[PDB]
Amino acid sequence: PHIGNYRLLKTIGKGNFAKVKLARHILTGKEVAVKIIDKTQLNSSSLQKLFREVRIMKVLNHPNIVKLFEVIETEKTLYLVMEYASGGEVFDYLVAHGRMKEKEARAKFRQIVSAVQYCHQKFIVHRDLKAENLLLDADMNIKIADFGCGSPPYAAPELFQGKKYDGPEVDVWSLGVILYTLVSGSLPFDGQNLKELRERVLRGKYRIPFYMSTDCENLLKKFLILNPSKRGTLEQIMKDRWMNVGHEDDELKPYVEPLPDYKDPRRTELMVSMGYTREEIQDSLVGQRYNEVMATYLLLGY
Numbered sequence: 512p513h514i515g516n517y518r519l520l521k522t523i524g525k526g527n528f529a530k531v532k533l534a535r536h537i538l539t540g541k542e543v544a545v546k547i548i549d550k551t552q553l554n555s556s557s558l559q560k561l562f563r564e565v566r567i568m569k570v571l572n573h574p575n576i577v578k579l580f581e582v583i584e585t586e587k588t589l590y591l592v593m594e595y596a597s598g599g600e601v602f603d604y605l606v607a608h609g610r611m612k613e614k615e616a617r618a619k620f621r622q623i624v625s626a627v628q629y630c631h632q633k634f635i636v637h638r639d640l641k642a643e644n645l646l647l648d649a650d651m652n653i654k655i656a657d658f659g660c661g662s663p664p665y666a667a668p669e670l671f672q673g674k675k676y677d678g679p680e681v682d683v684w685s686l687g688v689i690l691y692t693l694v695s696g697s698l699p700f701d702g703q704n705l706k707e708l709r710e711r712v713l714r715g716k717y718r719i720p721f722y723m724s725t726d727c728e729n730l731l732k733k734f735l736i737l738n739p740s741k742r743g744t745l746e747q748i749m750k751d752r753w754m755n756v757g758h759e760d761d762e763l764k765p766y767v768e769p770l771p772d773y774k775d776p777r778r779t780e781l782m783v784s785m786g787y788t789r790e791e792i793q794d795s796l797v798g799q800r801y802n803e804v805m806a807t808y809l810l811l812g813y
């Protein structure tokens with residue numbers, strides 16, 4: 512029930528020797544979601560993939576991606592203190608409420624497209640976008656999960672033809688699947704067997720719901736393109752008419768990262784009173800250490 516400046520409350524999930532426990536930052540009262548990986552178990556390959564995630568989480572600062580606050584390292588176990596998304600899975604929302612209205616789907620999809628483009632902007636490819644992989648916050652805002660089962664209907668055609676499969680245009684195909692799922696509540700490419708799943712995915716043809724708008728169906732045509740080269744960049748799909756209905760004022764533009772504020776005097780005095788030195792505060796922040804000093808600062812900005 513106690514790790515660092517944290518009190519473990521519930522358990523939002525267990526699994527692959529990792530336990531995600533809902534916690535409360537002790538010094539700030541702020542709620543967090545702590546991922547507890549037992550490194551002793553993890554096979555040789557799962558570790559490199561865990562370290563690649565740690566490296567990635569430390570870099571992304573988007574309001575639609577789960578923020579990382581702290582990394583607590585021990586020889587046997589790893590503690591990743593991340594942002595808690597109360598609303599749960601989008602998958603579980605789509606099963607509970609059915610399809611979203613295009614208006615509502617647009618609200619969430621803009622958030623998804625912005626966050627995935629921003630990843631590509633920093634040369635980071637998710638390669639595994641799923642509805643399970645997207646979370647919702649207290650205000651129904653998208654909070655994309657982690658980078659390291661319903662994995663096959665989101666698979667790009669290039670998976671079934673052995674071709675490279677390392678590019679960002681893989682995520683564009685996947686994003687198209689997600690758009691379809693968000694507006695229709697079902698998968699565009701289905702099957703009973705994977706031979707069937709492959710035959711549909713490679714044919715590239717999907718079922719169009721009688722209620723879907725010509726604009727929405729057009730955007731699907733911008734994502735779900737068979738030749739990877741022939742697939743549009745996320746920056747050019749951002750300019751799409753369906754994407755900007757109602758946002759005739761604010762067109763979807765690539766996420767422009769905010770500038771660093773490692774010197775806020777409110778949060779700095781609070782932390783100076785807490786026993787931390789101004790000196791260690793700036794060093795932890797500039798050094799992007801994700802230590803107890805940095806986590807105390809990040810969490811104080813709420």
Ligand SMILES: CC1(C)C(=O)N([C@H]2C=Cc3c(O)cccc32)c2nc(Nc3ccccc3)ncc21
Pocket residue numbers: 523524531544545546577593594595596597598599600643644646656657
């Ligand atoms: C730390 C982090 C990013 C994470 O690893 N998960 C896990 C844990 C359960 C789970 C899942 O059911 C689906 C995706 C991710 C996850 C998180 N789940 C939440 N909220 C939640 C709330 C109710 C139901 C499901 C998820 N917030 C943050 C995270």
